[PDB]
Amino acid sequence: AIAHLATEYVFSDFLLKEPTEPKFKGLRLELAVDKMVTCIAVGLPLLLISLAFAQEISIGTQISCFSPSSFSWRQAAFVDSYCWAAVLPLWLHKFFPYILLLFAILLYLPPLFWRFAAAPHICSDLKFIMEELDKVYNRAIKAAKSARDLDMRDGACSVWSHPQFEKPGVTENLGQSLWEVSESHFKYPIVEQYLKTKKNSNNLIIKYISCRLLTLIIILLACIYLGYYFSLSSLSDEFVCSIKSGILRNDSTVPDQFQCKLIAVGIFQLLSVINLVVYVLLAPVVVYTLFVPFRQKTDVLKVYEILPTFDVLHFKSEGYNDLSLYNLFLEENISEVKSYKCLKVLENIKSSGQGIDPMLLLTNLGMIKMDVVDGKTPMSAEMREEQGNQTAELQGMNIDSETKANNGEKNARQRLLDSSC
Amino acid sequence: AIAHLATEYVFSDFLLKEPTEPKFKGLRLELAVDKMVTCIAVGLPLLLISLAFAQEISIGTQISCFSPSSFSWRQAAFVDSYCWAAVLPLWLHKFFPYILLLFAILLYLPPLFWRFAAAPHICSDLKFIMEELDKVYNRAIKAAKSARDLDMRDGACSVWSHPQFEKPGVTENLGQSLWEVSESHFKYPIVEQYLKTKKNSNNLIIKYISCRLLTLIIILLACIYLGYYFSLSSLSDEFVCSIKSGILRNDSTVPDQFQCKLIAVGIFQLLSVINLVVYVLLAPVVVYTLFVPFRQKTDVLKVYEILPTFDVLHFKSEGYNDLSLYNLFLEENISEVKSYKCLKVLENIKSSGQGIDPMLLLTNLGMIKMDVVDGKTPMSAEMREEQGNQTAELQGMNIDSETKANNGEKNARQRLLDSSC
Amino acid sequence: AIAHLATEYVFSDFLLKEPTEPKFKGLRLELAVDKMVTCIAVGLPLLLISLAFAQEISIGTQISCFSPSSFSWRQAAFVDSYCWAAVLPLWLHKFFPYILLLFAILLYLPPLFWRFAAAPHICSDLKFIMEELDKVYNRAIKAAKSARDLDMRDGACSVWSHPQFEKPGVTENLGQSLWEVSESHFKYPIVEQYLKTKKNSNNLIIKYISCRLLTLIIILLACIYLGYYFSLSSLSDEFVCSIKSGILRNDSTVPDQFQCKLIAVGIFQLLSVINLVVYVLLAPVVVYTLFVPFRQKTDVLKVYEILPTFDVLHFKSEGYNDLSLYNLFLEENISEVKSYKCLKVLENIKSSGQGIDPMLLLTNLGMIKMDVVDGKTPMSAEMREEQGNQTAELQGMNIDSETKANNGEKNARQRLLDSSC
Amino acid sequence: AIAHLATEYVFSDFLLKEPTEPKFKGLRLELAVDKMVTCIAVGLPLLLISLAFAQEISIGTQISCFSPSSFSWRQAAFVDSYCWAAVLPLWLHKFFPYILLLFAILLYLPPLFWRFAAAPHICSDLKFIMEELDKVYNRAIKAAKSARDLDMRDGACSVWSHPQFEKPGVTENLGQSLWEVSESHFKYPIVEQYLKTKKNSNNLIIKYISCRLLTLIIILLACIYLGYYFSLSSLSDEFVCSIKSGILRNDSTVPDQFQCKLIAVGIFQLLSVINLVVYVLLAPVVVYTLFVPFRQKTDVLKVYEILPTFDVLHFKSEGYNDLSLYNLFLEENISEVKSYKCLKVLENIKSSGQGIDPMLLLTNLGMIKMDVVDGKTPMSAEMREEQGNQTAELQGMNIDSETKANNGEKNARQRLLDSSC
């Protein structure tokens, strides 16, 4: 049978889990709900019909007819073969396994079109925006670190701890008393305009909704077909058959009518119920997530809201604007970014000491001015909060490979079981 | 059966998704529409006939005949075998599965010829042009960066921020007060003549249209055959058979005529409809994209239109000129180029401040002349817009591997299901 | 059946597409036409007979005979078995599938002998000649670049742009006012004598024509056999059979003669036509390309015709001289050489300015003598045309691996489909 | 059947084509003729019998007997089974497929013994001798290059071109006026004694001839068996059978004698002819190459005959001396050595200028003494013939891997085709 072989052909497509050697390429390229819907909606029909093909062979088993005892073995076989072909439309039982394949094939194209067209475009855009996110994070603390030697009040910490300027940090260059201050006028980063660039020119969102709506209508078309077939299969499966057509029209030995019955509709009726109940439960899941302002209402960029110099999240939520789609992909792809975890702890220092009036930008100089005028001892405070927030993401920014979609193995289903007797 | 094994043999050819380790080798080598047309036009006939071969075995099932009860089991079997061979031309039903294979094989050669001949040639040409695209981008800003130390009006920014000249950028060499200006007379780049080089000598475009037109005519040849077969199968499938030829010509026990019927035309008739409706819908898609001035009317090189020094897009659109073909391949292969994303944000600064009169070439010196005469503070403005547009593409320009066309795995279809009873 | 398993065994041999990690190892080792001829001439017979073996089982299906009704089931089976063995020569129908295998096996040896013997020899020769081609290209411009500091007339460009001599190019050594001139007497390169070395000693060309002519004669031998078989199968397929030999010679119950018929010649006759029409169309393709002075009349080395110092293409075209064969391999293997693309643009500057009198050897000094006597500004013109033609091929000249002929995968055909009933 | 599964088991052994990552490991380890003989002599019997096993099943098909009509279905089946076992020796037809397997297995051991024992020993010996071949080549020119600064007559070329001594060659050390001359007394290289070391102690040649002669005698043993079987199968295949042995000896209902016939000898007779004609054609090929002084009479070391200082090929050709065997392996393994191609052009300069009196050792000083006394200009002649013959083989002399014998893939034959009906 052909039923359970596209099963493994699809099992190697939604199980990517790419072993991303580079710094960050764990790009899902589709939402989690999309994978769950596609696998269930397509795979489940293949599993059910695979059971059916295990017994719907030996066409003489599909239909049987009653014949007079005077007939021979071959004459009785002719009647069964004749009525199977020379057949309320009862031919729907004949093509029932064929139809369920057509639904599965038509339910697999919309995922394929997205993979061929909209997948490479969304891969580079997310990679570029997350590439430059850590650059802003690194420069912000480095500018604060470069401003360290300007606000010394404790001891003689203008310049000290000098066997090497950055002996734990870096073995190059040396430092001395500061004479420069950071005055910046270019406050807007690259990401600020990139958000506005994607705020118009709706060309990738249309490829998303169009693929989704094509899948939705196919589900309804399959749902009504199962209901129509279920009603038809619940009426009867027996009919009278006459083979007196041709030279046998004037035969006085062949009986006028024969009794025949299809004995495969019992299994088919059960299969239609399972598909029907699953589809009517899958439809609300698809419908509930059609709306753009669905779950994940909370903002994702609020971590960098006040970090370098500027403000973030000055925009609302809307519909057809090519936005709120990259935000969805960012949430499922923010798992591997070292800036996010580092910023995930700053907001939690809002307890006593850094409470109702937090700034969290130059907090290093907050507790180096009220101490003793005599005695520097700066080596502990001046580094324990400097390389603990920069060295983590300063490793491996050059690797770029492993973009193939799940080469994997043939470990999935293969060829059914029974081959004997 | 042989039906559903070229299915996996072709499934490993249009699913490349090469894991390109090098800087940029994600070369599709064919358009997205070509892959969709080839897979549907070739794969779908194989899927349909694979269902058919699951039951068209045991030749006694293919045809049946009515015989007198006085015949034995072997004598009745002789009649069925005789009329199956000794057969309106009714032999078209016998060779119907054979013909559909011939269409699939003939529909696979034009893709194969393009792969063997025109694939390696188009691989190097696109790689070379995109290799030199980033070189022009890097030198343009570097020349602007090298011209930084000439237009200082703020403070004493002629030379400053000197623990190291390019401590974030590069640890080599040092800088001082500028005395050289960039005077260029060789304005034409290499890409300018390469476009004109491909503007004539039409030798790769002919290999594209010739392969496409061969596929188109085969589709029409298959379309008319299905219509002719559908009309024939709708007339009748029964005939009279006589075996009295030879020593049996003067036999007084064998009846003169027998009634026979082919019982496989019912399934075959349904299969012809599915192929017919799909092909008549696939034909407009192929025809609509035959014209060279199809979709993607907008220019792709307009991003570099005024970037280094010159102007781009001084040419119109035409037909047989070996042009407008590399442009199509560039659009599907511009996904992985760091110059494109960097230039994709310059045009969006057209708001207030950089509006009706934009230049976007030396905008760094626009806002360093009206500030205070006293106080340099140049470290912020002089670097935050320099390594943010150059370091991105300065990583990994040496790797070159992974040009194999989808080694992949055997995860596709394999050997059907049923083997018992 | 054995028909459709050498199909995958050969599918892994002509689909190399080696993922050449090294600088250039994309060596085809055979012409494109050779692959197309071998795959079609060998594969197509296997595909056709694979259909035939799907039904030519159960030897009682191969032949059938008419027996008296008084015979039992076993007695009737004896007659069919007897006449199948105890058989115009009608045994050609028995061995028809066997013969077509013999043609396929004999049509596969000539490719195998070339692979074992002439493949490694041609691999190193093409690799060596293309290795030294870029060396001549690099030294030519470098000599021109080394001669830059001798012909200065503009400004004071004798020596300038000196924070580092080759800061974009190379971080080593320094330059000053030139005092040496390039006087060369050894004008002949290594490639000049290598062409003459291969101009005699015809030992690899004989291994090419001998393999080709063996394939050609086998095609004609198969072509006549199909025509002879087609005529034989069009006469009759019925004969009389007598089993009265031995102790049954004096048996009064066994009828003297029986009527038998072979019912597999109908499918075999169709298969012979398909092979015949394909072979008579493949023969002109092979014949048309037998001549050495076939397509690719234009020279390939005309790009380097005047580049370093000398002239190229001082030779005509001839036959048995071991030449004009490496030229064919060079054309299909000139795809990956950085010297070719670089030289492909020089000839197109033949427009106004560099028209009827082009030299294109030291054109850098053409436009540095008529400018202003005061003001050097040499940094733009002296480098923008120097590293743009040398750095491209100065990367990765050490890698050498991936010479295996298509390890690939088992993604091709495997084991047919039907296994039940 | 077991016939066509050692076919793929052997297809992965003679198709090595190792992807040798190291500098040179493309070691064939066996001659080309040995691979062709082994594959044809062993593979071809497996292909032929694989056709035979597609129909020699259902033992009732192997033999058939005529029985009285009064017998039942089971009684008639007993007669066929009895005479098949209770059987001119006619049992040779029963064991014919078994025997052809025994020939194939016995024809595969001699290749296996050579692989296990004599393969690793011959791998290191050829690797070592070719490792030291390039060392002699490199030192010869380097000594000539080191002697360059001693024979200057043109200009003031005693020392010149000194921004760096070997700026294109190597960035280390510097050169000046020469004061040392190359006086050598140790003229014998390591390879000179290694040739004499292998000139005696015949221990690897015996493992070669012994394996070859075992294969030769097996071919003759198979050849006579086919001729004996062909004569036997051409006499008759029918015999009388009596089952009256035991309690049936005094049975008055069982007929005394039965007529039986083997119907598989027709296919077997054809198979014997194909094996016979192939073997009698393969025997002269093996015999013609038994002689040690066969083809490849010309010397291979004549390229280095006068290169460094000494003379080569002072020895004749003989038989059992453990020599003339490494020479055969050298010819098939001289494909990948950079010294060979470099020396392949020196002998072709024998035209005018370097004709009847060639030396080709210090030809660099031939054309630097008759030029002008004033003006050095040495930079062109002193390097263009120095790094063009040394840098080629100065890359990658450390890699050592990929010695496995064709890991490959399962792309070969697998499991036959037909599984239904």
Numbering used by the authors:
A (entry chain D), B (entry chain E), C (entry chain F), D (entry chain G): 2 to 88, 101 to 434
Question: What does the primary publication say about this deposited structure?
Answer:
Pannexin1 (PANX1) is a large-pore ATP efflux channel with a broad distribution, which allows the exchange of molecules and ions smaller than 1 kDa between the cytoplasm and extracellular space. Pannexin is a family of large-pore forming channels that play pivotal roles in cell-to-cell communication. Among the three isoforms of Pannexin (PANX1, PANX2, and PANX3), PANX1 is ubiquitously expressed in mammalian cells and has been extensively studied for its diverse activation modes, association with diverse signaling molecules and broad cellular and tissue distribution. The regulation of the PANX1 channel is complicated and remains unclear, but it is commonly accepted that PANX1 is regulated by extracellular potassium, intracellular calcium, ATP, mechanical stimuli, voltage, low oxygen stress, S-nitrosylation, and caspase cleavage.
